[model samples]
Target: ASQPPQVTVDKLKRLENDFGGRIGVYAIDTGSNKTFGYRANERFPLCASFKGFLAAAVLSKSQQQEGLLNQRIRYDNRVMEPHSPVTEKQITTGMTVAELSAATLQYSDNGAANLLLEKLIGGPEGMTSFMRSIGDNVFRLDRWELELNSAIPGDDRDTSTPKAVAESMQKLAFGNVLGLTERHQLMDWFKGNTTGGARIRASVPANWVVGDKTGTCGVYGTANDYAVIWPVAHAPIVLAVYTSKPDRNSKHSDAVIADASRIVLESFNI
Candidate 1:
């Protein structure tokens, strides 16, 4: 049986200590099934990271409901939530489910996520069911946007462990959790994401193909990123990094996430 590389784990511990916060990391070599975990079972805020899975759930629905992706959803300003960068721009013209999925995954558009949740995927329960369907029992979404961003210490609401997040991502991205077409679409959405540049993406080399989703709870210094990375020289790797500080107003650090990602990637001996 394979084991985590001890040297890498030591470095990650030092990083967590230096940052003055708890860090959770999980990574798997897709080809070899080698793994590493640091507080991977501990719960951390899901934040907006769930949007990636939300888009996958919507795509799953589209497979059963023809034309669902093209269906137009018109939303008014009152429905818009804060931090909705893309959806706020399309208030008058409306957007298709496909476009909304992209907005939710790529920009972390709060309005688009809520609309898809309420109108298409049957809210948080539905999303949780979807995760369960994919064999991810540790994932949960108990609240909606804004409120869900509250990263209270020791609260399990709207949280998932790093190992669960990484495994589910591996199943969805590389395993048979989704149909080929929907799988490709989900990967495409993650690849086009604009929010993770400073996190996992920063650690990956330019030549490698990387797709990621990021979450920032804006409280308790909680933030995270998960990715499926295709290295030019080796087998693909799926990984997640999550961070949270005890202080409510403490700022989340992109540098910490990036450095942690670097450590995980290096751990695989690639």
Candidate 2:
């Protein structure tokens, strides 16, 4: 593997100093296998970011003939919540693994995520087993019950380090976890994700393509965004950014993410 370009440490230091909060960033430029970081190993709550992993796990199981994307499960009232668009609709029926995955990524739909988690776990024990299978030692979920129970204001529920989340993205992007077809499918799904903001997306020009996931946990004041940048005819780059005590409306967390990505992109002269 070729070496990734060097990241400017000064830029990261400036961002940290300006932001004055706990932040984690990780990046891997595939061409050179070079990595960059700042507290990348520091663990924090994952929030909706875990849906990315859940999507991967669903794809993995589908490959093993354990599940199908279009398989439908009914929705019950008990799972309905305030923030979920899907759940708020009060639709009696549920969606297939594929539909749930799409809704989760595209809308950051909490209800869909919980439903998919339930399906992946085949119940509570299954969810635990799936987490262990992924070696998510640093990531923890507050409750195993289906439906978004952790939606309470200022709840400190699920947590994960930036490096761990980035690694998971890398594995999915490179098809390391699944075969080529599955990897491509996962990327296609990610490309369709519509919820996140400028942080991960703004790193590259509009012509460049990026596949990513984002998470926000209110109670702990944590916000996260990450992506795999795929420049045409170039090796991909994986980037993850996490922030705590973030400015919610300003999308300050996203600015940090975009700044880090800009630093990396400029280093490559891209």
Candidate 3:
């Protein structure tokens, strides 16, 4: 088994210091199986970051057996309860599964995700069961995205370990759980993920391709970002940065997340 370099460890330690203990950084080099972590065992709320798994499973299963993506589906109250829509526009007609999944992933639309989950995969219970069946450590997501507004965002019912999220990303990247082509398809939308455009991508050069998902709750001072950052000169690596403030204020960890990204880049001498 490969080991993480001590040099990288020292730099990650510095990043923890940079945060003054406010955040945790966990990562894996899929190419080598080496890992880096600062609270790898602790769980953080996934928020919308859970949508990636939801998208992968639903799409892959549909395409693998039923060619379901070819059939268009409605996107109204029957598909989902009233909540946040993926796009600003109202849904007036049927849309392809890919189009609906794209809204869930590329834009993190709350309604579209629930719609796809319920219509294709089953709703809250079904989604959680699928994740559990795959050995995901995700806490039960029993509520809609817009409905999960507990005082502490983490308490709203979704949670995951940094390591677990890394494993989830591996399933998407390495095809351990689905058609490998599904990995590429999901990665495309993940690359188009706009929520984290400024979170991890803030420090990365424009040339680097970052396939990522971001979760944030202003009231809880929580910011979670996970991605496969493809360096222009080297193999890609998975990065998961999760932060939550105990104070429960609206102050998010934007700077903490971005600073860590920069620290990792500097450590890699990129």
Steric clashes per prediction:
0, 4, 0
Model 2 weakest 10-residue run by lDDT: 144-153
**TM-scores of the models, in the given order?**
0.97, 0.83, 0.85
Cα RMSD of predicted structure 1: 1.5
Which regions of candidate 3 deviate over 4 angstroms? 1-21, 76-90, 149-156, 265-270
What tens-digit string does per-residue lDDT give for candidate 2 at 1-270? 322433366667777778766667887877777777778887666767777777777787888875587688777656454457755564666577788777777677777766776656464345445666766555556664233223332444556677877777786678456877678778887887786657678778888888778776653356678888888788888888887753443233667767766775566553
Q: After superposition, how far is residue 58 of candidate 1 from its true place, in Å?
A: 0.6
- lDDT tens readout by residue for model 3, 44-93: 77767778777886766775667777677765554443435553354666
* Candidate ranking (lDDT, best to worst): 1, 3, 2
Ranking by TM-score: 1, 3, 2
Residues 1-270 of candidate 1 have per-residue lDDT tens digits of 333578888999999999999999999998988889999999999999999999989988898898899999998756689999999889889999999999999999999999999999989999999999999999999999989989999889999999999999999888887889999999999999999999999998889888999999988899999999999878889999999999998999999999999998977768
Choose the strongest candidate by lDDT. 1
Q: Which residue pairs collide in model 2, if any?
A: 2-32, 3-32, 45-159, 154-219
State candidate 1's TM-score: 0.97
